[PDB]
Design a protein around this ligand. Sequence first.
Ligand SMILES: Nc1ncnc2c1ncn2[C@@H]1O[C@H](CSCC[C@H](N)C(=O)O)[C@@H](O)[C@H]1O
Lengths: 265, 265
Amino acid sequence: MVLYFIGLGLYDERDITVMGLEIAKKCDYVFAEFYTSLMAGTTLGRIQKLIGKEIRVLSREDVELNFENIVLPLAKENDVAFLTPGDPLVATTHAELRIRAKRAGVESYVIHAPSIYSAVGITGLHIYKFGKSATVAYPEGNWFPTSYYDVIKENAERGLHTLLFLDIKAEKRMYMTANEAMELLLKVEDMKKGGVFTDDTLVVVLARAGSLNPTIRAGYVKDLIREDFGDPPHILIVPGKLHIVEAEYLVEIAGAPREILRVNV
Amino acid sequence: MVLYFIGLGLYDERDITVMGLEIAKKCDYVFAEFYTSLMAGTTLGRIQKLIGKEIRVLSREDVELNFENIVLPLAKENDVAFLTPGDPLVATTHAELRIRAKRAGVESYVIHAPSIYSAVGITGLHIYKFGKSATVAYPEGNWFPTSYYDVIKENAERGLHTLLFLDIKAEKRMYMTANEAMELLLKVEDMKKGGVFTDDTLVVVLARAGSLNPTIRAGYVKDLIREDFGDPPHILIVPGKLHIVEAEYLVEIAGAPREILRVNV
Ligand SMILES: Nc1ncnc2c1ncn2[C@@H]1O[C@H](CSCC[C@H](N)C(=O)O)[C@@H](O)[C@H]1O
């Protein structure tokens, strides 16, 4: 009679919360999507094995067009679950699915999980200092998205950090890397020239958060653009003016150039 | 030789991730702190029972002044776990502890869990639209802090949502309610008079995030400043201009007045 939105976490199946595991385990039907993000440490099997249920994986289409046709009806007479990577409501449109559940007479519940949005705290950057967020999207045809560039600008003026979610094309199995993102940013700089993103801008890269050996790096674009951060998923962060402790961490932990320690108050 | 920072999640003892509960059980020693926050939906006893390890609670002084004399020494020759509410390293000072671990030649790994920063997505407000964050502190003595007001000013000005943490006297186990926070904001408005927070201002209140039955309420200050949002802690959110999808979710899910569909979009 109820629908459960359950996050699976950052990297592998275990990143699910105890609450989530016990709820899934006792659900009649189990659905899930793997297009809003990439969990690089698991497979559908492990998930099924860990949960003890078969999972019917839905596509973006199935969801954005037929959620209320494929999943809701079932919830009407059973306890159904819908699994997603990270937290199910962060940087997605799944929140709107809840309204569909309401309009279908189905009560829904959200079981949170660790999200990349807060996991970036491992970069040593103060979470409260992050400003507006944005996504570096793959250009399509002659359409070249640029707004994410303005966000960085607007935040930096206020001294706020910018969190840049990198694009993903699950079906095409395309996962944007920090490098490609840095590449697109540089090209946007040329056609705007706002002195916002250049070879001397400081950036921070976080790859595969949730894994025990994630890639945490900070430095100048020039020195990082061609660097290997390992397999996806990747996220890019353009920090604002740093606090001494943030810099001390970036250097001591992310291998940033000791010269960022000498902050220009 | 290994120090494990494990997040306990948001509300009860079931909010810890499966990876966290396993790494915790296999540790030799287990520390925890409940000064940055409390798990209002559980107890130290229930967490101890779930992990099967006695837990030593450290104070804000035990950590900020003697982390290296209390926890790291044991981490040199054993597997030690440091448990904290929410997601590790989100609390602005916990990051430098990893630096202390590095300095002591100790290995450290961060085991994530749900944070209030990502969990607030249950309000239906888009995550990327959150700006700088802040804490509403109680005035006291001759000290009357008001920055959180300006934070709201700069975010709403750029159409960004402001996440407001409410003061907590962790030790005395005393919380600031959402109602109290509003009353304080009105007084700040009444003094600075910047057209930021008034009776007509729209706010969102989140309580007990992480439990299956969170309180999600949205509406105008004048109709919510005296409303009963249940037990603490409470999170207050002052939204910026809303996306129609956001407003609809606040109406359909958080019981907000239809008036917001024409006044706040
Ligand atoms: N474990 C991880 N490590 C690094 N980046 C990650 C990540 N998980 C997600 N991301 C980033 O966020 C994008 C997916 S956005 C969807 C996020 C999800 N709801 C959550 O709560 O995490 C990815 O393309 C990537 O840029």
